[PDB]
Symmetry: C4
Subunit: 387 residues, 4 copies
């Protein structure tokens, strides 16, 4: 057992190969599958796992009612092997949680589970399933974290948490965690910026996060930092806007794009010098479709020109949250950190006539060999028996 | 593989961080979940498991009828990983049992399962799943034990069993067990005391148990002993009465408090010199709510003053049994024995209009970092389809 | 990994401690549990397992219809951990089989599964799941074997199979198997005797089997042999008759007792010099009740006097097959081979108004510490939804 | 952990002993069993697994509707232990796929999953569950592969893929794969031949495949090749025609037999010098029955004389696909590669009046000990509740 190094670069990729699809909603029409949202994938040096927030209820049972609601004492962070449906019979218990993160440092799993009331929530940190630290809300307004993997470099793992308003300026903290103990945190000086639900990855010993501006930005904010939590900030400049909702593509900005800026969706992007791989919905107004776009000057340039598009989910199909995950050299035998991504395919409320809301998932890994666009959608036929 | 030392002291703690929640009754509305009661948690040097007594039946199935009944030949002691629902598809069989204890000595699991008739019950002891001893009823009146983990120090494990009436003086025995063999037993000289369902923990090579007085005490009796089973006895002095039912808080006693003293509920407390952490129900009269209370002179002092109260379950929510469990240094890497506790959230009879009685659970570990009070209730909507 | 020695004596025992109960039928009212019959228990140097013949169907589903039928192409030998319900989600596949045996030599599992037509069935032998030998019917009349564990001594495993009429003289062969290969077999000279469904155990390097005389004996036949398959034969002499059906207890015989001799039930007994532990039904005419009797001169003496009786299942409750299993010193750390037993608790046809027949199980291990008689019955309320 | 040598010859065999049967459709009537088709078996040096293509849906649930359809975005390659039903609670996820292959090289599993559109499908190759390559459609017309195990020799694994029309000349490529990376590929010069759904096995360091001619052959084509992918081609000469449909047996041909030659079924055969073991349907016109036939000159001779026939599934029972699988010496301890085979038992559309199509399986291993013919059919009673 050895710490992941996290010191190689991101592998450059030409397209995305499908890695997993779980068909959870399809299978939960009959089988015992958790009602879930906020899924994400994270890997150890030996296997990849799907992490997700349960509702403490199964699909197609009465306790699925009301599950549009984000935060309750019943929600738990749990994990199963990638591509398997999340069921009480295959799922490992991680933490009591209505907001979460997790990541493996090479030696053990770190899990971060936020529960408690909206005015003073507490994140419980676990290393190898043992409680190792806690951190309490510091603005008393829904302490919340990534809903995707935290990032590890040389035995330290890093995450971002936000506390405060979700329709205005909030507070954003970056954390360095070692064996599940917070060893350093910094509060970001970021006036007129808004960060939430960061998708963070390691690249050459430093962390880059792409996040959700729920306040006033239809492009995505980014923060990058070193092991000492010295950070830089910015927004993705590309006029290929990454949030949902958003405007039609036009000239972008290196600040927040106010047009259609309020509200948002968790997502991700990968930086490659001045270029960017952008994952986004296909709809500008709802969580429908998904596509990957390579924009070779999109990190720093404001034009709406891009070089490559790869379809993932079709425009008339439900999508949802998306996030980054990596596969480190210790897992693959490669010489670079491999970028991958997952998409949550949300079914039910508020868009469909059900009592419940739940998602399934798809994921892909970046390759340089041949790939193809298609649509891999959820596939479930709603409503269900219980509706 | 090495014996747990058990020679460090209990970690002083300032608050309780939430560790697990299984949502078993919400899930068993559709999934295949055992009807259970009397769960408890116990840990090895590698993992924590939930142990429970099934009723040989699944929730929402006709065999769950009459599960108010305590003792039958169908009841079995099983276990699963902490925070998962108890299902036949994830559950390890331990013993045939309608009363039980279990604990791991660092090398293997000890399990204690009592079955057979009320007038001649037999505890079957197993080590690593092999039967290694038996002990038979010596008062022919419901031989019964902790319904929580036994306690181990340096290769020896310890438990308490009771035999006799449950509305008067009974007989209380203390056992030393090594590799599943009873190596010593003593009968307590405790006239006017009553002890059952003891919650016992190791602390500086010695055992402390905090039990239930079902005869005439609304404070909790305690017994502590060394490896030779030389023991001392008393009741918790605090005016913050620990049993349910009980009177409102007032001046306490260092012997049994007869007011509201008949009947009771399994519980626990942790001793820290002259102070005490008390877990108890929030209602004085029924199994509702739960809270933890730090009384810095409550072990030996009789006033009803205390310094910390942390909410766990809201007063209008169903409560039940509670018990201690520890995490040893061999598991955590800490220099002290970490105290944790679980709470059984009972649903169904006699308080609700169902044909069945079954419980879910929640657990908490002691920490010194920030924590928050809240309510983490069972969450199921009764009645169920079978009712 | 080392061969079981099989050279110590059977442990002398004063009574029987309950080891397992699975509540299969109760649990299969809702959950996914196999329809099964002919269960049995067998242990490796590390765990004990329940082996059973499925009907290729689950309880409370329509394909359970007609499962009174013994032999079909759908029946499979499968195994799960002891005390767990046999479910498609916890059961390991062993062999296609409508008659079976299994046993662990200390290194790997041997399994023996008979399938094919009644006029030319074939036993498929597997060692660690790999086909290692076959043997075909030699009388073309339902080749059949123990329906309980084979017995191992110093790397060789032994079993008995029968072929021919079930209401008359048939043929009986004994086999020595090494790494799943038959290395020697002999056909017994046993005129006027009948052997099937043998319960065989090792004791001081030799094998003793107690079997079912379906032709004309209400006491049990026995055959014992050394590693060379040199054998001795006889019937249990005790007037405490062991089969079902049988007469009421009277003077026994060392030959087959013809009174109520026809038909039978698989059973077991353990020899201790001139004495015998007899397991049997409590009813003389149907498979109801179960009891363990120590008769100190019952192996060779014909009187109906015994010294000890221990109730297991009460007279008005369904029972069924029973068999021996052992726990070798390599598993327990004892200096003797420990005797144990299981009882199948048959539910459904032909005695009850259902479409199906299935069993659950209980088992016990022999001890010298205190024990108690009771009744641990199946517990299921028939008929079921499907009926 | 060591690479499978693959340098020994195939074990000559005299008959087929039954190895597994899952009863999946019978079990799926109540249990949580995937709708599947195109199952196959493949073994490592430690265990044998069944691989299968799910339809992303369970039996007896509405999502099973329309599962006659071959290719969708929901279909996934998963695996479970041989003889267990494929359930989401015992199934390992492998790949997103509507056509697949898998094999173990002695160190890790290679999996090949083709998904995406008919005009541009991509095979995703994984080694130990990590994506290691991709190959994309080169004729834009349903890239498709074996639906059975690939074959490995000394650390290289080999498969066959087809792209083009399924009613005319297509293009056929052979691949060498090492640690999941394509290291060589060749396109076959095979005018007037057609190959798909190849059953390929190793034998004396070389690969033999027997395939399906869907264009104009009612005998089966074959291709054999060495590690450098230098190949030879031919059709099986026997007048015992192996495809389905086919004409009645008569004088065969060493090229494609046009009579009844369009259409087909996946199958297999084993070469032993100039002789062949042929598995085929018993019906000449639909997928009914199964039998094995040893024709000692059938590889190269055109007569319809043969010497052994062993019944496997009766002529009035549904059969389907069949394929080879091997057990290497590293798994068995033998001095030769053991031949085995599986048969897919298809139920539902198009032959039965259901909304769904799904398969169970049986499997057999070659032996030289005694064996028997019989029928081991699927056994389910259609229609189901969902129909
Ligand atoms: C899905 O859930 C909604 C919301 O219900 C609320 O949350 C649930 C999980 C439960 O804890 C409910 O107890 C809780 O009400 C269900 O709508 C609700 O239905 C109930 C009874 O069917 C309504 O009860 C009424 O309440 C009013 C007071 O406002 C009384 O005057 C009435 O006499 C009656 O008691 C309840 O009002 C209603 N809640 C809302 C917000 O409309 C809904 O039925 C459920 N759907 C299914 C399929 O279960
Ligand atoms: C199987 O699928 C068919 C085709 O989609 C279903 O039939 C359709 O049902 C929808 C829902 O009401 C109707 O709007 C269409 O008129 C139907 N089309 C046809 C051709 O019938 C059918 O209900 C499905 N069966 C199940 C069990 O889901
Ligand atoms: C707390 C504010 C935040 C942004 C609006 O709400 C999130 C939005 C969500 C959404 O936009 O789908 C779902 C998240 N589960 C929720 N997070 C929490 C912690 O409740
Ligand atoms: C036997 C007396 C005892 C105290 C009154 O009953 C206990 C009370 C219980 C209770 O108060 O909820 C549940 C326990 N399962 C039961 N124990 C047994 C062995 O049945
Ligand atoms: C084959 C004769 C034998 C004795 C009558 O039948 C057995 C009796 C049985 C019984 O008495 O319950 C059930 C067994 N499963 C059956 N064995 C076989 C192989 O079918
Ligand atoms: C694509 C042509 C091919 C031959 C007609 O179809 C196959 C026939 C099938 C069949 O004859 O049963 C089922 C296979 N799953 C299908 N393969 C794919 C990739 O769809
Ligand atoms: C990265 O870290 C590894 C492990 O410490 C080290 O061997 C190597 O020299 C470092 N950097 C690169 C880019 O290879
Ligand atoms: C990684 O951390 C270890 C332990 O703190 C330290 O010795 C080492 O210098 C670190 N490596 C780098 C490249 O910072
Ligand atoms: C605890 O016991 C261990 C036994 O290995 C011993 O080494 C040590 O002296 C003791 N520790 C404390 C904290 O007293
Ligand atoms: C249900 O339980 C009651 C006792 O509460 C019992 O006496 C009654 O007979 C039971 N009903 C069934 C159907 O088992
Ligand atoms: C613990 O037990 C061992 C073996 O019985 C003994 O040698 C040792 O002295 C004990 N340690 C203490 C601290 O009592
Ligand atoms: C059971 O099988 C019998 C015999 O085939 C049949 O006649 C009967 O209707 C079936 N019953 C049920 C409930 O399926
Ligand atoms: C055990 O078996 C081996 C043969 O494998 C033999 O050499 C050895 O002597 C045997 N022991 C006895 C006591 O028979
Ligand atoms: C097997 O492959 C290894 C590594 O390529 C090589 O050393 C060896 O010569 C090969 N064996 C044969 C028989 O070709
Ligand atoms: Ca926004
Ligand atoms: Ca651009
Ligand atoms: Ca009391
Ligand atoms: Ca006080
Ligand atoms: Ca008889
Ligand atoms: Ca006698
Ligand atoms: Ca053809
Ligand atoms: Ca021929």
């Amino acid at each position: 057992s050895v710490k992941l190094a996290g010191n190689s670069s991101l592998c450059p990729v030409s397209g995305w190969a499908i890695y997993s699809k779980d068909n959870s909603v399809r299978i939960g029409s009959k089988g015992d599958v958790f009602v879930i949202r906020e899924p994400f994938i994270s890997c150890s040096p030996l296997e990849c796992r799907t992490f997700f927030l349960t509702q403490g209820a199964l699909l197609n049972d009465k306790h699925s009612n009301g599950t549009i609601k984000d935060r309750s004492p019943y929600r738990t962070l749990m994990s199963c092997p990638i591509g398997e449906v999340p069921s009480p019979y295959n799922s490992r218990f991680e933490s009591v949680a209505w907001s979460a993160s997790a990541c493996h440092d090479g030696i053990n799993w770190l899990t971060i589970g936020i529960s408690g009331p909206d005015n003073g929530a507490v994140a419980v940190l676990k290393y190898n399933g043992i409680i190792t630290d806690t951190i309490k809300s510091w603005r008393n307004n829904i302490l919340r974290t990534q809903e995707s993997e935290c990032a590890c470099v040389n035995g330290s793992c890093f995450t971002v948490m936000t506390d405060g308003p979700n329709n205005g300026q909030a507070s954003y903290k970056i954390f360095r965690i070692e064996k599940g103990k917070i060893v350093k945190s910094v509060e970001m000086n970021a006036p007129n910026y808004y960060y939430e639900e960061c998708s963070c990855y390691p690249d050459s010993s430093e962390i880059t996060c792409v996040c959700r501006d729920n306040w006033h930005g239809s492009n995505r904010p980014w923060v990058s930092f070193n092991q000492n939590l010295e950070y830089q900030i910015g927004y993705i400049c590309s006029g290929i806007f990454g949030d949902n909702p958003r405007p039609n593509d036009k000239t972008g900005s290196c600040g927040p794009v106010s047009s259609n800026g309020a509200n948002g969706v968790k997502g991700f992007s990968f930086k490659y010098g001045n270029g960017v791989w952008i994952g986004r919905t296909k709809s500008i107004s709802s969580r429908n479709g998904f596509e990957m776009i390579w924009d070779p000057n999109g990190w720093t340039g404001t034009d709406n020109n891009f070089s490559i598009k790869q379809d993932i989910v079709g425009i008339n199909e439900w999508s949802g949250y998306s996030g980054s995950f990596v596969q480190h050299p210790e897992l693959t035998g490669l010489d670079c950190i491999r970028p991958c991504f997952w998409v949550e395919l949300i079914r039910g409320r508020p868009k469909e006539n059900t009592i419940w809301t739940s998602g399934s998932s798809i994921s892909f890994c970046g390759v340089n060999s041949d790939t193809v666009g298609w649509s891999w959608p959820d596939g479930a036929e709603l409503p269900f028996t219980i509706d």
